[PDB]
C-alpha cells in the first residue's frame, strides 16, 4: 500500500461547477438570465415580500 491509489473513495469527487464556459453554464451564470441577478437580492427568506 503506497501513495499510488490510496485515492479518494470513488465518490468524494470534489467538482465545483464553472459558469464561464461556452457549453454548460454560459452567457449568463449558473442560472441568471435576466436582472436583479447581480450583487444580491433582498433577503429573500424572512424578508422580501
Partner RNA sequence: UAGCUGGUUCUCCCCGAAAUGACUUUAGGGUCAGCCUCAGGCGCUGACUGGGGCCUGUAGAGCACUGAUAGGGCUAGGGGGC
When the beta carbons of 14 and 35 are compared against RNA, the nearer one is 35
Q: Is 34 in the site for RNA (CB under 7 A)?
A: yes
Give Cα separations from 31 to 2, 8, 9 (angstroms): 42, 30, 30
Spatial distance between the Cα atoms of 37 and 8, rounded to a whole number of angstroms: 36
Q: Using CB atoms, what's the residue nearest to Mg ion?
A: 39
Interacting residues toward Mg ion by CB under 5 A: 39-40
39 binds RNA (CB under 7 A): yes
Cα(25)–Cα(1) distance, integer angstroms: 40
Name which of 4 and 40 has its Cβ closer to RNA.
Answer: 40
Amino acid at each position: 500500500d503506497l501513495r499510488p491509489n490510496p485515492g479518494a473513495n470513488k465518490r468524494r469527487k470534489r467538482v465545483g461547477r464553472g459558469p464561464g464556459s461556452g457549453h454548460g453554464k454560459t452567457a449568463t451564470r449558473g442560472h441568471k438570465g435576466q436582472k436583479s441577478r447581480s450583487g444580491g437580492l433582498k433577503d429573500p427568506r424572512r424578508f422580501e415580500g
